[PDB]
Design an enzyme around this catalytic site. Structure first.
Site, mmCIF file in Angstrom:
data_model
loop_
_atom_site.group_PDB
_atom_site.id
_atom_site.type_symbol
_atom_site.label_atom_id
_atom_site.label_comp_id
_atom_site.label_asym_id
_atom_site.label_seq_id
_atom_site.Cartn_x
_atom_site.Cartn_y
_atom_site.Cartn_z
ATOM 1 N N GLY A 150 0.772 -1.230 0.000
ATOM 2 C CA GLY A 150 0.000 0.000 0.000
ATOM 3 C C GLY A 150 0.805 1.282 0.000
ATOM 4 O O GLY A 150 2.032 1.273 0.084
ATOM 5 N N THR A 151 0.077 2.388 -0.102
ATOM 6 C CA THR A 151 0.616 3.735 -0.004
ATOM 7 C C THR A 151 1.385 3.911 1.300
ATOM 8 O O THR A 151 1.130 3.204 2.280
ATOM 9 C CB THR A 151 -0.533 4.750 -0.069
#
Ligand SMILES: [Mg+2]
Ligand SMILES: [Mg+2]
Ligand SMILES: [Mg+2]
Ligand SMILES: [Mg+2]
Ligand SMILES: [Mg+2]
Ligand SMILES: [Mg+2]
Lengths: 250, 243, 204, 237, 222, 233, 235, 196, 198
Positions: free
Chosen positions: D23-24
């Site tokens: 993820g980010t």
């Protein structure tokens, strides 16, 4: 949150075996030897306190348990399963019997109750059988002295004498040789101690052995007086010293 | 992958592999701990390791205050540890409410062991990969150590140790208790019982500890409390003179 | 009105030398209207005897309940229930209905087959055990029964004499009650045998 | 999930972590009187409305939450956090202390690693705020593990962020202001973006400071946001 | 009913009269009102007779199980807490009023419990319709640090106050002594001051007095 | 890696992937294309309807949720019915209890949370439908994209379904022009119908092909089908 | 609970397979009584004969069962059967007709066969009873939940052998004393042991009650079996 | 019943009489009406003794749990738990409770929870049947930041009047002092306070 | 109110039940048959609260018919009556009790005797040579105490019943519109269609 095994974990195999019951019985075979011997005026149950560390205090762990004032139990197999079974048996003695008839259950009926709790772990969804075999020794007014074996399947049998766990086959043999129907309690304790010596590796003394009887009433252990028709418990756990006194004349 | 290795059913040998595997999880934190009994106290010591320098050292603990009187050190992953902490706390409060007195150390131990036994038997629960060491000065039994494992087993100890290097410390203590012949440490102040524990951990593990390398819990008559870094630093100085 | 006054009836039990006696009237009424001359209020389960006064639907229901429970008791225990044990069973069965009770006044009589000891007991509708050794009374003429028994009674009566005393206590208490009577029955109980006698009394 | 491997590990949780790693990158920085949260928002397309896909969530009034991994899972966790915070305030009147709140999330996440009928959460959550006795920053893994932090980072750019976060703890041993840490959060997010450079990004900052926001969670916007962006752009070159 | 509970230096004593009534009528002229919660914790009840007997046996059974579960002697405060919580749950509809007394590893205890679930502690207590007669005696003679012998006297005197002056009470005095060191001693019919005088006449009937209609032997076996 | 890891929504793959959810996403790409875009004053949904036969009716892709909100579907149609029903209820609750029109953003959050619970429950399945939600609320025109994973993003414009990548590149190009089509409904609809064209290996789009929906400042959400769309072909 | 491509219930067939290893039980129905005989599974000298019943159980005053299979399973079913009989007695003030009790139990077994995903009970029953509609009756039931009526029948081990021997020597006008003799003969011939001794047997009759008009259940005490083992000529 | 709590300079003091009646009969003349729910959080109970004991017992439970998880609870937290129980169960409780406590941040605090289940934070509070006779006296004699000995006097005199006039109140006067110094039990006898 | 009589002669049981159905000030019907046949040799008459009366009879009738078909056997009068008592005994402590009183007339085949059972709404059961529910008993019981014999024929019992109905027509304040009279014997259940002016 919520069980996804609403089905029996004990099922019949193509040959008619109930695998999990079979395996639980193997768990019992690996367990420390326990035994019971019935005399004319008592029953004795005995086992070995196999300690997990010399840093543990073996008195804080009891393998022999009072179920009712006149009934006691010992086991071979998985300790934790025993502990919870004892709790459930103590409770069922009250809820299914004492709270109804104002007296304690006779041995066969209590044994029957434990067997039902164990049968149920064999059929209910999402559980394994109990990994233990119990020996239940007791007295009641109308049946006298009795001794029962209860297996993981929930089956029970009355015994004159038996042994379960590790050296059970040799000990069962050793008992068939020694047992008769004229035995006094002291003689039965003596045989119990001898039988257990073949099974025990290390030290054999009142600190490494656990021994209880179902004898006569101990009005001294009752806790009160003034009621002549209450004579006290017949279950009595022998002390470290009491065990040692009987090994010197062995 | 057979079922008898995924859930808590018996293997043909009569074993429960998920239980056995849960015992291995207990060591995954690489923390050793030990417990001793004084004359009127009980002491738990556990290694404190703070590898990441972004971590707030004050929030990294495996010692819990269960009730006013009972303390618990856990050897195992923190998520499971905190699960057991919360329940023990809840169970301890409920005992007092229903039965009118403080839950005894051994009884809480039995209770938590019973809960563990259940996960051993019911398929949908996994065991908790932790070993719980419960300490107090019981009003009826005096200083007490009781320890529960993923199998549902519990017993009382004169002293005890837990973790990867568990055995080194066990044999060290075993050796001591052979000499003293008694089943505790003959000392008045808990301050000197904490010292003994720290000393015998040093010798058994062959390591020196700073104030930040350790965690100490002390139970006396009616209180269980943990020492600050400074209470420990004072202890470390006290041993340095003479030894 | 009062559930314990709708149908009427009385039960008395006494102990003597190596015996017990239990007696009841035979009336079943519906207020003023006498309905049945043949309503027996004493039952037995093995050698244990139980009389019940009160609302008749509860008298019947309880007999059927205790038959049920003593039957199951015998199959499990492989022996017949004893007086003392049965008393405990009657008690807990009644208290189980604490906030919706059976409107009854049970009376237990028997001889313990092991000890040979004579045994009687009484209960209130929620199962409180009345443990007198001499006599137990119940029903819509209990006031009259207490008076009779307290005068007529003396310990260690031989079966043949206890029969007279208990019959007299019942008959005369019944005759001062508008809701009791219409025939009477008396059991004389010994360890070995039990004799049942129907009494001759005023039919009014 | 409820399955221990032979060496005592939980493969399902370990796999859930891979979803987080994927993820980010998001971060949290603890300052002498508050906390700062910042997150990287990948601009998939010019069609996304700027400033209008808010990732940072408030719990009660005094707690901020940011997360990396399966965004929906994070929302599920925040909903629960909010119920758990409302419940606490209902009984005890005082708003939930941060350690108290951390454990509430902790027990909830751990519970999702006990039963074969459920999967662990696919997020790591960085959160904290100001309570009765100071500022608190936490990070919670898919296993339910959490500890206090001086600084915390998770997601794709976690390593470079940690390196920058470790440097700050060394240069400022006596504190670090809320106004400063907001700037620094912009910088660290920009540096951590190096890994996801193929696509453009948008910066979101929020803070909860005793002196700057009155111990309440507030989004960083307008002149303060622009000034932090500038600092980050100017210190990247 | 008259029930009292008196503390002395090394323990606690409880006493009760032996009369049960159905309104104005005396049902049992010598019942036992002293009940056992556990070996060293005893109990006396007033109010709904079935209720005090039951709540005593339920909490008695649960205390036994608790003791076994914990490997400890039962404590008076446990019997107290369980009784009060149970009585409270039932909002007063279990008409049990109790004096619970005993010794445990923590000393000796005397408590009262009311049907609605409130409890109190004290050195001397009374309950029942003979409550006030007994309290008058207790307030007249209680002192701090009574001996065992003094405590039995004072409790026994208080029951007599109720036996003589309260119509709800009569017959005999039962006492139970619970000292810290020892087994509890249950002194049944400790005093019997109400012997029925011999009757003026014998009422034994000449055999054949009663008219019999028919007769048969009843079958017990199978 | 793909083997024992797609049995249920409750298993992670060793890569960190949830395969049931990715397979539910593949039901969208299979579905007929639909487009959404907005200016400041209006928001528009344009959908290509698909018939299963030449004698059959073209199946509907636009559902109305409230007077200020509606969505277009692509994927499993029965799922869209389930999700629009819930959305109608949330709108309804907001009106009745708070006398408030439900914000389009909250509608997004609400659909996201509902979708999520089906990515974590055993014996359930993820939703297999994609949604484009348009609305006019107290902060103007809004357009949302909903994926069965739970991810909901707010955009100026988008398209989902088969060959949808054409329209999405077009809108990404036409951005600066259409955003400013304020106070002109018919021009914005024209910009949407022209956008759905870039997604046709199919053919001409007829008066049955075609389904348009509009909402804005003084326009309640309305559906145009058949005859009423003729003027846009 | 599931079906096989053959239309068989796996778990039931395996339960029946389990039963074929349990000690043989035999029921023989005569005009004036019924015989129940069963063989205990190879035991030990130390087993308490006097206070043991592993195969023969009383259901009510007029009905009994001989068990073959899991004892613990049987005790579950027996207990419910005992209750069903008492419910019937309470409702009608008449002792339950034998078939009604058999059907009920058989239905509880059929249940586990059709839903709930629990293992069937590994139990087969021989029912021996009397009522005033059909007189003496003999029934069988197994884990499938099917039940049938018989004049003579066996369950457990060697039923194939035992059934052929019973078919050979059974005749409709038999007295109970002749049925006792057949039951023991048949067991002796089908045993997997040296001799059939008293310590390995459970025996019961349901007769016309010595001299009365009532029905009596005699469960043979260990010594009584040893007596009847000589009388018939097997010692 | 006469019960009060008063905040002063160093903390807070709880006072109560010792009489419990059923009708005109005194069931207990030496009741302890000062109830501990935590080391330094105490309360005085009024109304149904069954109801208030059950409540006090539950609050003590909640606060013990609170202390195990989150540390020491504020007096405000204690009051909130009482209010929660009292409010949410108002149709089945006759319970009036005065909560008083001490910590280093907030010093001495008093909360009164009357019949309805409302909460009121006050400099001092009076309640119980006997309190009605001392509204005048207390309003005229209470000052803020009083010394310990002054406060003990204010309670002593106040409750002696309450006892003097209300037959439900009486016996001994008990007090609990709550300060940073710790916890102090005070008891005063009729032979003393009557002569005031 | 409602008339419900039963008399047990030597070879049969006879039931007589009033024909009127009255609601308030109006006699709505004068040919009401307050009876359900339970099995071929068992008849039940009923009286009480308006709705429950028929609802209860039909419920019992359904259950007994179910038993018959399941067992291909007819329950004895004693068993049927015991069942009925239990249903009423249950009902008396239920939320809303059945307010129905019943007579059960049956011919037992195994014994070859007629049997009459009186059961009130409380579930009070008794076997009687003759019985009644409601006020009718206050008149008829004394008459039958006098005129009844155990050896009476079916015809004799009908005369005795006629004597009871005359007394009730003479002394009862309400007009019950005569009785429907049914006989239960070894051949089943038959109705005497002529009694109104016989
Ligand atoms: Mg498990
Ligand atoms: Mg699982
Ligand atoms: Mg009476
Ligand atoms: Mg009379
Ligand atoms: Mg990270
Ligand atoms: Mg006063």
């Amino acid at each position: 949150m919520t069980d996804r095994y609403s089905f029996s974990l004990t099922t019949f195999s193509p040959s008619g075996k109930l695998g999990q019951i079979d395996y639980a019985l193997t768990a019992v075979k690996q367990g420390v030897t326990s035994l019971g011997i019935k005399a004319t005026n008592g029953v004795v149950i005995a086992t070995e306190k196999k300690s997990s560390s010399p840093l543990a205090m073996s008195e804080t762990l009891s393998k022999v348990s009072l179920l009712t004032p006149d009934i006691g139990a010992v086991y071979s197999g998985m300790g934790p399963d025993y502990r919870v079974l004892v709790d459930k048996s103590r409770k069922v003695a009250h809820t299914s019997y004492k709270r109804i008839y104002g007296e304690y259950p006779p041995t066969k009926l209590l044994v029957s109750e434990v067997a039902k709790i164990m049968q149920e772990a064999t059929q209910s969804g999402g559980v394994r059988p109990f990994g233990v075999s119990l020996l239940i020794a007791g007295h009641d007014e109308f049946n006298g002295f009795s001794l029962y074996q209860v297996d993981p399947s929930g089956s029970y049998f009355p015994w004159k004498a038996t042994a379960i766990g590790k050296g059970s086959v040799a000990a069962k043999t050793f008992l068939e040789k020694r047992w008769n129907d004229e035995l006094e309690l002291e003689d039965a304790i003596h045989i119990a101690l001898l039988t257990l010596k073949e099974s025990v590796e290390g030290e054999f003394n009142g600190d490494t052995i656990e021994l209880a009887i179902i004898g006569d009433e101990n009005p001294d252990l009752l806790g009160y007086t003034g009621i002549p028709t209450d004579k006290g418990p017949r279950f009595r756990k022998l002390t470290s010293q009491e065990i040692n006194d009987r090994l010197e004349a062995l | 992958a057979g079922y008898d290795r995924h859930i808590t059913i018996f293997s043909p040998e009569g074993r429960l592999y998920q239980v056995e595997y849960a015992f291995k999880a207990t060591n995954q934190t690489n923390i050793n701990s030990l417990a001793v009994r004084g004359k009127d106290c009980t002491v738990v010591i556990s290694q404190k390791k703070v590898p990441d320098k972004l971590l707030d050292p004050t929030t990294v603990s495996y010692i819990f205050c269960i009730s006013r009187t009972i303390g618990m050190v856990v050897n195992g992953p923190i998520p499971d540890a905190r699960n057991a902490a919360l329940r023990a706390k809840a169970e301890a409060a409920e005992f007092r409410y229903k039965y009118g007195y403080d839950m005894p150390c051994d009884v809480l131990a039995k209770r938590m062991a019973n809960l563990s036994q259940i996960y051993t038997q019911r398929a949908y629960m996994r065991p908790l990969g932790v070993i719980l060491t419960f300490v107090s000065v019981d009003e009826e039994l005096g200083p007490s150590i009781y320890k529960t494992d993923p199998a549902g087993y519990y017993v009382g100890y004169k002293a005890t140790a837990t973790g990867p290097k568990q055995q080194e410390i066990t044999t060290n203590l075993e050796n001591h208790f052979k000499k003293s012949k008694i089943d505790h440490i003959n000392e008045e102040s808990w301050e000197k019982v904490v010292e003994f524990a720290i000393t015998h951990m040093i010798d058994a593990l062959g390591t020196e500890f700073s104030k930040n390398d350790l965690e100490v819990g002390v139970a006396t008559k009616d209180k269980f409390f943990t020492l600050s870094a400074e209470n420990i630093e004072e202890r470390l100085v006290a041993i340095a003179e003479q030894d | 009105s009062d559930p314990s006054s709708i149908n009427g009836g009385i039960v008395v039990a006494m102990t003597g030398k190596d015996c017990v006696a239990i007696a009841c009237d035979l009336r079943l009424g519906s207020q003023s209207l006498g309905v049945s001359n043949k309503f027996e209020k004493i039952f037995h389960y093995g050698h244990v005897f139980l009389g019940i006064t009160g609302l008749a639907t509860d008298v019947t229901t309880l007999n059927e309940m205790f038959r049920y429970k003593t039957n199951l008791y015998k199959l499990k225990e492989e022996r017949a229930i004893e007086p003392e044990t049965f008393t405990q069973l009657v008690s807990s069965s009644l208290y189980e209905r604490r906030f919706g009770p059976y409107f009854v006044g049970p009376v237990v009589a028997g001889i313990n087959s092991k000890s040979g000891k004579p045994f009687i007991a009484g209960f209130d509708l929620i199962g409180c055990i009345d443990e007198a050794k001499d006599f137990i009374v119940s029903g819509t003429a209990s006031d009259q029964l207490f008076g009779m028994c307290e005068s007529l009674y003396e310990p260690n009566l031989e079966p043949e004499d206890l029969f007279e005393t208990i019959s007299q206590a019942l008959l005369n208490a019944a005759d001062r009650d508008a809701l009791s009577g219409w025939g009477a029955v008396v059991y004389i109980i010994k360890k070995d045998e039990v004799v049942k006698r129907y009494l001759k009394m005023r039919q009014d | 999930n409820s399955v221990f491997s032979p060496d005592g590990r939980n493969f399902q949780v370990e796999y859930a972590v891979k979803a987080v790693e994927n993820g980010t990158t998001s971060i949290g920085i603890k300052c002498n009187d508050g906390v700062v949260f910042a997150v990287e928002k990948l601009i998939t397309s010019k069609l996304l409305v700027p400033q209008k896909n808010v990732k940072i969530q408030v719990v009660d009034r005094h707690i901020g939450c940011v997360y990396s991994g399966l965004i929906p899972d994070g929302r599920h966790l925040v909903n629960r956090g909010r119920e758990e915070a409302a419940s606490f305030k209902k009984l005890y009147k005082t708003p939930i202390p941060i350690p108290a709140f951390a454990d509430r999330l902790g027990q909830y996440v751990q519970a999702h690693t006990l039963y074969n009928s459920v999967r662990p959460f696919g997020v790591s959550t960085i959160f904290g705020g100001v309570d009765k006795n100071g500022a608190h920053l936490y990070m919670l893994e898919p296993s339910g593990s959490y500890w206090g932090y001086k600084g915390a980072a998770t997601g794709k750019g976690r390593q470079s962020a940690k390196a920058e976060l470790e440097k700050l703890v060394d240069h400022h041993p006596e504190g670090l202001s809320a106004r400063e840490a907001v700037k620094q959060a912009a910088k660290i997010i920009y540096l951590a973006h190096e890994d996801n450079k193929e696509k453009d990004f948008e910066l979101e900052i929020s803070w909860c400071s005793l002196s700057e926001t009155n111990g309440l969670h507030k989004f960083v916007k307008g002149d303060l946001l622009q000034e932090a962006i500038d600092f980050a752009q100017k210190e990247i070159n | 009913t008259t029930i009292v509970g008196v503390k002395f230096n090394n323990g606690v004593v409880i006493a009760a009269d032996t009369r049960s009534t159905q309104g104005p009528i005396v049902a049992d002229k010598n019942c036992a009102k002293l009940h056992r919660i556990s070996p060293k914790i005893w109990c006396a009840g007033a109010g709904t007779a079935a209720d005090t007997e039951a709540v005593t046996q339920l909490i008695g059974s649960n205390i036994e199980l608790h003791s076994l579960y914990t490997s400890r002697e039962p404590r008076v405060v446990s019997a107290l807490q369980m009784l009060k919580q149970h009585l409270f749950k039932y909002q007063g509809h279990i008409g049990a009023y109790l004096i619970v007394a005993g010794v445990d590893p923590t000393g000796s205890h005397l408590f009262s419990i009311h049907a609605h679930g409130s409890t109190d502690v004290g050195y001397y207590l009374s309950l029942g319709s003979g409550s006030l007669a007994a309290m008058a005696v207790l307030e007249s003679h209680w002192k701090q640090d009574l001996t065992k012998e003094e405590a039995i006297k004072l409790a026994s005197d208080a029951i007599q106050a109720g036996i003589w002056n309260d119509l709800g009470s009569g017959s005999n005095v039962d006492v139970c002594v619970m000292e810290i060191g020892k087994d509890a001693e249950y002194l049944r019919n400790y005093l019997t001051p109400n012997v029925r005088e011999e009757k003026q006449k014998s009422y034994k009937f000449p055999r054949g007095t009663t008219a019999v209609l028919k007769e048969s032997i009843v079958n017990i076996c199978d | 890696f793909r083997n024992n890891y797609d049995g249920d929504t409750v298993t992670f793959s060793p890569t960190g992937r949830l395969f049931q959810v990715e397979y539910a996403l593949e039901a969208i790409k299979q579905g007929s294309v639909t487009v959404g875009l907005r200016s400041n004053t209006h928001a528009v949904l344009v959908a290509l309807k698909r018939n299963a036969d030449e004698l059959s009716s073209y199946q509907k892709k636009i559902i109305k949720c409230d007077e200020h909100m509606g969505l277009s579907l692509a994927g499993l149609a029965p799922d869209a019915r389930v999700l629009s029903n819930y959305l109608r209820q949330q709108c309804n609750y907001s009106s009745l209890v708070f006398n408030r029109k439900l914000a389009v953003e909250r509608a997004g959050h609400l659909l996201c949370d509902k979708a999520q619970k089906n990515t974590q429950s055993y014996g359930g399945r993820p939703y297999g439908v994609g949604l484009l939600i348009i609305g006019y609320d107290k902060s103007g025109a809004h357009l949302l994209e909903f994926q069965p994973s739970g991810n909901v993003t707010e955009l100026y414009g988008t398209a989902i379904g088969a060959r949808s990548q054409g329209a999405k590149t077009y809108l990404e190009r036409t951005l600066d022009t259409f955003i400013k089509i304020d106070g002109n409904p018919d021009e914005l609809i024209k910009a949407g119908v022209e956008a759905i064209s870039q997604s046709l290996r199919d053919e001409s789009l007829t008066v049955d092909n075609l389904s348009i929906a509009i909402v804005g400042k003084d326009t309640p959400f309305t559906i145009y089908d058949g005859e009423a769309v003729a003027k846009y072909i | 609970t599931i079906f096989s491509p053959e239309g068989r219930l796996y778990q039931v067939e395996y339960a029946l397979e389990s039963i074929s290893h349990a000690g043989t039980a035999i029921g023989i129905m005569a005009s004036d009584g019924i015989v129940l005989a069963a063989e205990r599974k190879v035991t030990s000298t130390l087993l308490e004969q006097d206070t043991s019943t592993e195969k023969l159980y009383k259901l009510n005053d007029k009905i009994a069962v001989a068990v073959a299979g899991l004892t613990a399973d049987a005790e579950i079913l027996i207990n419910t059967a005992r209750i069903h009989a008492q419910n019937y007695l309470k409702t009608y003030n008449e002792d339950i007709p034998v078939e009604i009790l058999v059907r009920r139990l058989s239905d509880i077994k059929q249940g586990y066969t059709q839903h709930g995903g629990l293992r069937p009970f590994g139990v087969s029953f021989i029912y021996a009873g009397y009522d005033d509609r059909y007189g003496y009756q003999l029934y069988t039931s197994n884990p499938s939940g099917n039940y049938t009526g018989w004049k003579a029948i066996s369950v457990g081990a060697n039923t194939s052998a035992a059934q052929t021997l019973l078919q050979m020597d059974y005749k409709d006008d038999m007295k109970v004393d002749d049925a006792i003799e057949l039951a023991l003969k048949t067991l002796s011939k089908t045993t997997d042991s040296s001799a059939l001794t008293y310590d390995r047997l459970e025996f019961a009759t349901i007769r016309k009650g010595a001299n009365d008009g009532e029905v009596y259940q005699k469960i043979f005490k260990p010594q009584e079996i040893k007596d009847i083992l000589v009388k018939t000529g097997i010692t | 019943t006469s019960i009060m709590a008063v905040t002063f300079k160093d903390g807070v003091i709880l006072g109560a009489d010792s009489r419990t009646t059923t009708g005109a009969y005194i069931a207990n003349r030496v009741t302890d009406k000062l109830t501990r729910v935590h080391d330094k959080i105490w309360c005085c109970r009024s109304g149904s003794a069954a109801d208030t004991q059950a409540i006090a017992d539950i609050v003590q439970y909640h606060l013990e749990l609170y202390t195990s998880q989150y540390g020491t609870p504020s007096t405000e937290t204690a009051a909130s738990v009482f209010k929660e129980l009292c409010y949410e169960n108002k149709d089945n409780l006759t319970a009036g409770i005065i909560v008083a406590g001490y910590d280093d941040k907030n010093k001495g605090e008093v909360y009164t929870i009357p019949l309805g289940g409302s909460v009121h934070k006050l400099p001092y509070a009076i309640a119980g049947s006997g309190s009605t006779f001392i509204y005048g006296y207390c309003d005229k004699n209470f000052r803020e930041n009083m010394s310990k000995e002054e406060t003990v006097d204010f309670i002593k005199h106040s409750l002696s009047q309450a006892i003097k006039w209300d037959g439900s109140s009486g016996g001994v006067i008990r007090m609990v002092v709550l300060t940073a110094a710790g916890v102090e039990r005070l008891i005063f006898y009729p032979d003393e306070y009557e002569q005031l | 109110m409602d008339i419900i009589l039963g008399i047990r002669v030597q070879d049969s049981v006879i039931l007589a039940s009033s024909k009127a159905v009255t609601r308030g000030i109006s006699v709505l019907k004068d040919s009401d048959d307050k009876t359900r046949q339970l099995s071929p040799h068992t008849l039940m008459s009923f009286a009480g609260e308006a709705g429950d009366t028929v609802q209860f009879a039909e419920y019992i009738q359904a259950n007994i018919q179910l038993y018959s078909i399941r067992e291909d056997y007819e329950l004895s009068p004693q068993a049927v009556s015991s069942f009925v008592r239990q249903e009423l005994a249950k009902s008396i402590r239920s939320r809303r009790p059945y307010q129905v009183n019943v007579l059960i007339g049956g011919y037992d085949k195994k014994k070859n005797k007629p049997e009459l059972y009186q059961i009130d709404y409380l579930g009070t059961k008794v076997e009687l040579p003759y019985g009644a529910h409601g006020y009718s008993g206050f008149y008829t019981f004394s008459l039958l105490d006098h005129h009844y014999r155990p050896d009476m024929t079916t015809e004799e019992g009908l005369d005795l019943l006629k004597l009871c109905v005359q007394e009730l027509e003479k002394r009862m304040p309400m007009d019950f519109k005569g009785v429907i009279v049914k006989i239960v014997d070894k051949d089943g259940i038959r109705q005497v269609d002529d009694f109104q002016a016989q």
